[PDB]
Every structure is written in structure tokens, then in C-alpha cells.
Design an enzyme around this catalytic site. Sequence first.
Site, short mmCIF file in Angstrom:
data_model
loop_
_atom_site.label_atom_id
_atom_site.label_comp_id
_atom_site.label_asym_id
_atom_site.label_seq_id
_atom_site.Cartn_x
_atom_site.Cartn_y
_atom_site.Cartn_z
N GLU A 1 0.80 -1.22 0.00
CA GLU A 1 0.00 0.00 0.00
C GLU A 1 0.83 1.27 0.00
O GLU A 1 0.58 2.18 -0.79
CB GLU A 1 -0.96 0.06 1.20
CG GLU A 1 -2.12 -0.92 1.15
CD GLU A 1 -3.06 -0.74 -0.04
OE1 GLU A 1 -3.04 0.33 -0.69
OE2 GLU A 1 -3.83 -1.68 -0.30
N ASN B 1 -7.62 9.85 -5.72
CA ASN B 1 -8.24 8.99 -6.72
C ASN B 1 -9.13 9.89 -7.57
O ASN B 1 -10.26 10.22 -7.18
CB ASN B 1 -9.06 7.88 -6.05
CG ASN B 1 -8.22 7.00 -5.14
OD1 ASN B 1 -7.21 6.42 -5.56
ND2 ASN B 1 -8.62 6.91 -3.88
N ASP C 1 -13.04 8.87 -8.31
CA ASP C 1 -14.20 9.03 -7.43
C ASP C 1 -14.09 10.15 -6.41
O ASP C 1 -14.91 10.22 -5.49
CB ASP C 1 -14.54 7.72 -6.72
CG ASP C 1 -13.50 7.31 -5.70
OD1 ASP C 1 -12.48 8.01 -5.56
OD2 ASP C 1 -13.70 6.29 -5.02
N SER D 1 -12.00 10.58 -3.95
CA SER D 1 -11.59 10.19 -2.60
C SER D 1 -10.06 10.14 -2.58
O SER D 1 -9.43 10.16 -3.63
CB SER D 1 -12.15 8.81 -2.24
OG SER D 1 -11.53 7.80 -3.00
N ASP E 1 -6.60 8.19 -0.45
CA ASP E 1 -6.10 7.13 0.43
C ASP E 1 -5.00 7.76 1.28
O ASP E 1 -4.11 8.45 0.76
CB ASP E 1 -5.56 5.98 -0.40
CG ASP E 1 -6.64 5.29 -1.19
OD1 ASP E 1 -7.73 5.06 -0.63
OD2 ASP E 1 -6.41 4.98 -2.37
N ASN F 1 -9.05 4.81 2.97
CA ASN F 1 -9.89 5.68 2.15
C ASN F 1 -10.82 6.70 2.86
O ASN F 1 -11.54 6.36 3.82
CB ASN F 1 -10.67 4.81 1.17
CG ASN F 1 -11.27 5.60 0.03
OD1 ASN F 1 -12.42 6.01 0.10
ND2 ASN F 1 -10.50 5.79 -1.04
#
Length: 130
Positions: free
Chosen positions: A35, A46, A49, A51, A53, A60
Site C-alpha cells: 500500500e 483517486n 471518485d 476520494s 487514500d 480511504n
Amino acid sequence: KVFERCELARTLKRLGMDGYRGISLANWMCLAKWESGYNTRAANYNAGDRSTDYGIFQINSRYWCNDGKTPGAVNACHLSCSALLQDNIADAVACAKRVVRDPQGIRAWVAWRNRCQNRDVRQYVQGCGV
Ligand code: NA
């Protein structure tokens, strides 16, 4: 902060992650590795959408932490996403524990399915004294 492998392994064990909700320490190590590369300040947007991380576990903003700019988002961990960018990973760990308390467990992260599931994850903790 960019953690060294064994340093992180010992830190996670002390924080009670070994076997949490049936998840072994080596699995948590594999997840953090893929990750973020054991990096706590990583924040990836991102575009798809809206959002983002956050941190070592790349949690998220739509469901787990609040950053204020993610549409229709909830804050299940009851934390500002900024909390997941600290060098001290106590809050990130508490939130990670929350995520896996849901039905999907560790599968909530697609990277785990791709790079950790059904593989020999022993290498991530070998020689760390945990
Ligand atoms: Na949120």
C-alpha cells in the site's frame, strides 16, 4: 516516516495487531508494504471518485476518515484524515482495526488480494524477533 521492515513488525506487534480478527502480523506487513512501502506520509488522490487514500495503510476518505472534500463520505474511524499522516501510527492502527471489524476483513484492500492472499508471506517478518 519511512519505517524499516523489522522496526515496523515490532511496532505492530506491540500495538496488538498479531492475530487481530484472525489476521496474522505477516499479512499486515504485506499490506503496508504494497500500500505505501511502509511510508506514513503517503496520500494518493483517486481522480476517478474524488476520494483520497491516507497513510501507511492507505485508508480511504469515503468511509473511514474525514477530509471534508470527499462527496457523500462517512467517518467510521471518527478521525481527521490528517491523523493518518503522522509518524506515530497509533491512530492509523486503531482505524485499520476498525476496517477489518467489517465483514470483508483484510479483503477490504484490493492490493492484499493481488499481492498477499494465498502467498508465502513469511518473508515480511523473518528475522524481526516477533
Ligand atoms: Na470520510
